[PDB]
Amino acid sequence: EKNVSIVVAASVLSSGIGINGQLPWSISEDLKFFSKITNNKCDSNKKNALIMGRKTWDSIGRRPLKNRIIVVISSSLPQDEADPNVVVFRNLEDSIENLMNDDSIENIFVCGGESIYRDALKDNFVDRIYLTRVALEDIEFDTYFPEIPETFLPVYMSQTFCTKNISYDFMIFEKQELKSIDDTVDLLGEIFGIRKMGNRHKFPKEEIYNTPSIRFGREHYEFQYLDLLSRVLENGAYRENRTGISTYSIFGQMMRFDMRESFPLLTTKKVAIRSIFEELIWFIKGDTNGNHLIEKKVYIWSGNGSKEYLERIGLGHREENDLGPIYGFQWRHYNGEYKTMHDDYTGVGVDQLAKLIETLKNNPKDRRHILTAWNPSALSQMALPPCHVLSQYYVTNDNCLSCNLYQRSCDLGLGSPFNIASYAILTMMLAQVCGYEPGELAIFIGDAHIYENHLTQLKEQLSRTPRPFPQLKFKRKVENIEDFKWEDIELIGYYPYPTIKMDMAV
Amino acid sequence: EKNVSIVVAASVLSSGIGINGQLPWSISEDLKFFSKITNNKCDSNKKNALIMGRKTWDSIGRRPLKNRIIVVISSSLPQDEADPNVVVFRNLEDSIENLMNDDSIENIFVCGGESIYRDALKDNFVDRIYLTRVALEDIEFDTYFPEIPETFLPVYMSQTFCTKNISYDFMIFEKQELKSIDDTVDLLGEIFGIRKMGNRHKFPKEEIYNTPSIRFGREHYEFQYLDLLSRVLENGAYRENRTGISTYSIFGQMMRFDMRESFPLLTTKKVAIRSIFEELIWFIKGDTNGNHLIEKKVYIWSGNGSKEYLERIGLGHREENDLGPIYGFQWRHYNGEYKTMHDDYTGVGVDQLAKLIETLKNNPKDRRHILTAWNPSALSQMALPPCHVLSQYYVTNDNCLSCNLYQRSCDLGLGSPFNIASYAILTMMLAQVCGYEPGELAIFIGDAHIYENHLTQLKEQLSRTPRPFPQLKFKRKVENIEDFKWEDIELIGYYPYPTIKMDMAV
């Protein structure tokens, strides 16, 4: 009785694994994973057995794999004994003679063939599944990996990797069958109530935890966002705010996202990437005219720019969509005297963005690459004080650009998915203009909250297992950061779950 | 063969446990801990046995403990059989007859008496040690808990708790006498190099990890600082900076500290608490004259305010120790035009601190309690740009005041211990003035680094197991936050390791 594992690489939506006798992709790192996972063993005087169908045996050229024994399932192949590295069996059950005897075989791997995969799962021979999810869907397949039966549960999901602009990750599924420290912490939590800080940061219950069977392998960085939702649902205090809609709120949180091997665009929900880009280039250009976004069919700033809202907050003198000195006016004209959105501000104020770009490439190891929007002198004139308040940038020794952001207030349902993608694009833009590669993104949050009219929606999103992040590439090298257009951006391999409608609190 | 555990409460330095036949303190929560840990059992048809010396039996009034069986070690007590809840043995070894039979005894606890403790450890009867460390030292003891033998290793250390201004924590010692996920992550780290983000955040090696035997019980929040040192030693990139002293640096980190039950003043090193307060009240008053700190024998700002340094950074026109508009000038006079440190600035600029105090008590649930010091218009005039750049404050539903801080650059050897205690005091001051209690402290860091001339010192500090945090209380209620004096502060129960000298990089 030894272990039997499936190794397979399948597409993210339809589970395609083959086409015309070969693979529908060419990913070198995935073959290295197959090699390392099938060679891994404890006893040096034993070998691992790789079971595969005859058509897969043809596709690998009918040549042996070093250090391993290949088991071919075939009805017509001659049961040859000349090659000790290749053995032939007439059916899959008989090949499980690797179990019944042969103590020189340590582990068994079901290595390919839809027919072999389907029979191994149908007869309940498989203990573990190593799955490489490939983000390629609008191509032709003729061979599929069968649906994983309900007896299996995921226990690991890696970060997203990139090869030739193709996104992929690695997952492990398993077939389902000291206390002294945990007891002491429980007893201390009964004695001290909320006096014990751990009781103020309770671990989320299973019913609000995304894919709960993945306990020690939540490596995919979309869990950084999903688990923050779970923490708010678990520990969030019911609080009122300036809007009529109350929230559940906690204070002091963070999220990390990689940007070297993928782009952090959420997959558990279709995110309006075009509106995100249009808002960001609107910031970069220094613009505060809300009509320019509406003219581009972007209405995210409509609520905080209506005549009724502006009059209510004491800005009735202002034009309809004149939002005042907000993001993009502090970026390009910090401390500049604001009049209206139609005036000419060329030369007024401190151009933070221009100075940031120059210091990033003239003094990369400088510890002061800072862009701020919190101006106490201008807060009263803003339609809304800045939420993403301050950001810092860092040039690594291997010429990557990382970004930290402090956010004072985080609408997790609507604002947060935008903020993650927004500063990811901005860091990539700064990276290209300064001649670096994208690095890492960290977001530090003050008031992280969920509006109570988003509870049904966000619990729906928490029921969806994440998929690998897509890739985002620029189609050309711009001469100035203001020259970026929506046509220059290419989003590769984005296969999200359907859209989830959520209303904005004015 | 069942478990034998010691339960004891001893003072943090000298391990005193008794005086004149009674305890040297009165801590209710510790008695409840003793009750819960000695009653904890699995089988409802079994009981736990509590072994104690005769003098301890006298000190508890010679009355039984509910649901448990007391085993008294005595040479003269009559071996009575009337009470089935109290049994008498003539020596400690014979009383371990609880093991040899009596299947109604599930667990065994050695519950007190220096004579009983010393014999239980000397004869190697003990498997586990439950230790309550009490921060009371300059009092009289006549009974001591023996030194824990080297066969034991700590596995848990709780946060600091407070009873009647007495600090204490709980520790567990043990006599130290699936792999599929870990293997897959290792294999993925061999294929992808620094392309896998986990390889850029490697777990610290044991030789640079403070108290490595505590793996799953690093609850004491001083580990938030110590483990950040370890992360920098493990993954820090060697980088140059404006000073002549290079650092090892990482980007994007955080630390959390409780403030309800203790004050986060590091114990692995004696911290100059008076210099911290004197600098903070210097900020609150709006002062930028460096001589006022030197006149109070505080020299932390001397290096960045000397004639040689000021001339070197292009501020040769300034008087000696005229630091310019820095912390406390942006706090009280944001955007105010700075001339020299001798001028009258009453009324100029935005008084952020005054507006913060007013909003904290008139609109507590407001999500904009923000204090910033990053002024792009004034950076060129500063002797040093702000390190602690922005802070946000939060009023919980149970009337506690929490604080978030973003720090762009963190000297972990010298600056970081100061920043932790500084913003803890400030949040406590704001809490008293606004009528709240202290909450939690979170510090988010950009460039966290260690200067290379601090490596020997910080590795020395990493060899010291932390002690419970002290308490900090105010002796009077001030009418204005500016009225706080050093005499108003009481530091209770601070027993740190000796001072560690480290030079500042100019």
Ligand SMILES: NC(=O)C1=CN([C@@H]2O[C@H](COP(=O)(O)OP(=O)(O)OC[C@H]3O[C@@H](n4cnc5c(N)ncnc54)[C@H](OP(=O)(O)O)[C@@H]3O)[C@@H](O)[C@H]2O)C=CC1
């Ligand atoms: N992405 C991935 O991870 C992988 C993809 N692939 C791809 O999948 C395709 C191949 O898979 P597939 O089309 O299903 O072919 P198979 O690899 O499953 O091979 C099928 C052959 O196996 C033999 N066989 C299967 N079942 C039995 C049985 N019950 N009794 C006796 N013999 C049996 C038969 O050989 P015979 O006719 O001689 O009797 C059959 O023709 C290729 O394109 C390949 O590249 C393959 C492996 C992995």
Ligand SMILES: NC(=O)C1=CN([C@@H]2O[C@H](COP(=O)(O)OP(=O)(O)OC[C@H]3O[C@@H](n4cnc5c(N)ncnc54)[C@H](OP(=O)(O)O)[C@@H]3O)[C@@H](O)[C@H]2O)C=CC1
């Ligand atoms: N902080 C804490 O966790 C605890 C503190 N304490 C404190 O410690 C003090 C008491 O401890 P301590 O002074 O050491 O007294 P003990 O509790 O250890 O009791 C001593 C008595 O136990 C009997 N005894 C001990 N060893 C032997 C032996 N080898 N053979 C036979 N009998 C033995 C003797 O009784 P006899 O003379 O009858 O023969 C001896 O006088 C008190 O002040 C108490 O408050 C006590 C428990 C816990």
Ligand SMILES: CN(Cc1cnc2nc(N)nc(N)c2n1)c1ccc(C(=O)N[C@@H](CCC(=O)O)C(=O)O)cc1
């Ligand atoms: C057609 N085929 C089946 C195949 C292909 N990709 C997969 N990918 C995954 N993730 N899992 C599988 N079971 C899998 N199977 C192949 C193709 C190549 C090799 C192969 O060359 N393996 C070498 C790998 C050489 C390398 O280092 O690049 C080895 O040493 O194992 C094996 C099976």
Ligand SMILES: CN(Cc1cnc2nc(N)nc(N)c2n1)c1ccc(C(=O)N[C@@H](CCC(=O)O)C(=O)O)cc1
């Ligand atoms: C004098 N003495 C010895 C004593 C006191 N404090 C300790 N504290 C610790 N952490 N460990 C010990 N072994 C210990 N022993 C005592 C004192 C009171 C009780 C006691 O009353 N226990 C009650 C609890 C009373 C309550 O809940 O407060 C129980 O039911 O266990 C036991 C032992």
Ligand SMILES: Nc1nc2[nH]cc(Cc3ccc(C(=O)Nc4cc(Cl)ccc4C(=O)O)cc3)c2c(=O)[nH]1
């Ligand atoms: N409380 C609060 N006030 C805000 N003021 C300004 C913002 C910024 C802001 C405002 C609205 C939206 C928004 O609807 N996004 C969308 C979400 C989904 Cl799920 C689908 C489509 C859109 C879309 O619009 O294409 C995103 C950001 C904002 C915010 O996010 N929250």
Ligand SMILES: Nc1nc2[nH]cc(Cc3ccc(C(=O)Nc4cc(Cl)ccc4C(=O)O)cc3)c2c(=O)[nH]1
């Ligand atoms: N690189 C850099 N520049 C700085 N400018 C301004 C600061 C702020 C700053 C400056 C100096 C010290 C400092 O010596 N603390 C001490 C440390 C120990 Cl271990 C013992 C005594 C003292 C003491 O002095 O009583 C603490 C903070 C600071 C800093 O910490 N690092």
Ligand SMILES: O=c1[nH]c(=O)n([C@H]2C[C@H](O)[C@@H](COP(=O)(O)O)O2)cc1F
């Ligand atoms: O980029 C944004 N991110 C964000 O989270 N909000 C939300 C946070 C909060 O729910 C709401 C109001 O901010 P506040 O009430 O704190 O002034 O705006 C708004 C943005 F524009």
Ligand SMILES: O=c1[nH]c(=O)n([C@H]2C[C@H](O)[C@@H](COP(=O)(O)O)O2)cc1F
């Ligand atoms: O409160 C402080 N905290 C701190 O960490 N530094 C250190 C950080 C850095 O090592 C040094 C210089 O900052 P920088 O060269 O990035 O401008 O000051 C200085 C302070 F005053």
